[PDB]
Design a binder for this molecule. Structure first.
Ligand SMILES: O=C(OCc1ccccc1)c1cn[nH]c1
Ligand SMILES: O=C(OCc1ccccc1)c1cn[nH]c1
Ligand SMILES: O=C(OCc1ccccc1)c1cn[nH]c1
Ligand SMILES: O=C(OCc1ccccc1)c1cn[nH]c1
Lengths: 213, 204
């Protein structure tokens, strides 16, 4: 079983992934995704979640007092606290695999500029904390990254959602708009098909991801 | 002004997207159909999306000026540089695949009349392109008129002391040159720790 809690100032953003869990995995008690409005933990009548950065400059920084209260309530010592940010360690398939066996993920969605560093630093003294990036680009907030993380992890959790690059794939029909499926794939020579696919993979990786070599 | 069209068999998942400087439309791929997928030629696990449905959908939605975007973990990397580039496009069409992918002939065909970009938003596997579409849309739209190479170091805000943890004193000093130097140092230190590849070093 896995419990996932997402904390965000835009709770409805996570509606698609909550309303995407098969009834079977929820009823088997194997997965539960809860979404929490960060403003639940604000202290002032204006429900402030951010403030100006120390040391100046434009941008806003999310308040440590608000986040601290939220995580105090939601997390336990067993929690894996995931903080998406473009400044994080890379989140990869290996990460997805590892987190797929966790009992409790809490995902703290920050907004542009980010969360006061003391929030993660404090949490790290009593739980495992992971600042991660899903890719080298900047979003306005962590919510899309949370969607990506939840999907990549949960699809590795048995029955929940239902090296080199992979080369091109083909299916019916055998001919379409003047383009034939490569005849080797229809040859019934499965050793040859494997070797063809390996070369396709090598060529595609060289062309698109030479870093992987 | 930009138009973004998203094509998907799960249009509900694209609810998280004024309009004004951009218009975003989401289209149900099934509006152009039996099934949308079948087993792969040459064998293997999973299903491949048939080219036929996609062809008709893209014929209606795309023009020769369209930038066709296809999220896939086998794509060229989508980075901040890509986002800057696409931020000046008139028309993005994002083809969301499911299962093992879309028949390659869809992209090959589209490429004879428009520019096509197969892209990865990162090295992991999703069940479908919808989440990636959301990521791309966000990354692009915040760069659109009227809205790297290092990791940013930590940020702080009030109070100056919290749970016995102080904001770095230099940030309270009002000395802009020292604040600038400290932040530059924190950025480089964080980058070498978390992303040594960005500074030209071997990954862990
Ligand atoms: O933009 C992202 O997260 C939102 C965020 C969080 C903190 C500060 C700025 C922006 C992101 C990019 N790759 N992975 C995550
Ligand atoms: O090309 C693929 O894998 C690329 C990959 C994935 C994860 C980490 C690194 C590289 C692929 C295509 N469909 N499914 C997987
Ligand atoms: O999983 C992704 O897209 C869905 C997809 C599309 C085609 C085949 C398999 C999976 C993706 C990962 N990084 N960038 C995109
Ligand atoms: O650390 C950051 O950017 C990292 C980044 C971005 C884009 C490509 C590579 C790396 C950041 C945090 N808040 N705003 C920006």
């Amino acid at each position: 079983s896995m419990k996932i809690d997402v904390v965000t100032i835009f709770p409805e953003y996570l509606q698609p992934v909550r309303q995407s869990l098969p009834g079977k995995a929820i009823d088997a008690g194997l997965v539960d995704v809860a979404v929490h409005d960060l403003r639940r933990w604000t202290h002032d009548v204006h429900k402030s979640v951010d403030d100006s950065p120390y040391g100046g400059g434009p941008g806003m920084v999310m308040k440590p007092t608000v986040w601290g209260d939220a995580l105090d309530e939601i997390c336990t010592s067993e929690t894996l606290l995931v903080v998406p940010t473009p400044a994080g360690y890379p989140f990869t398939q290996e990460t997805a695999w590892q987190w797929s066996t966790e009992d409790h993920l809490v995902i703290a969605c920050g907004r542009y500029e980010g969360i006061d560093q003391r929030v993660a630093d404090d949490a790290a003294t009593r739980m495992r904390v992971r600042e991660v990036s899903i890719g080298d680009y900047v979003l306005n907030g962590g919510e899309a990254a949370a969607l990506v993380i939840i999907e990549a992890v949960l699809r590795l959790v048995p029955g929940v959602l239902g090296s080199l690059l992979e080369g091109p794939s083909y299916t019916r029909p055998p001919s379409w708009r003047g383009m034939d499926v490569p005849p080797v794939l229809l040859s019934g020579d499965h050793a040859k098909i494997a070797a063809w696919r390996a070369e396709q993979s090598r060529q595609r990786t060289i062309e698109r991801r030479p870093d992987l070599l």
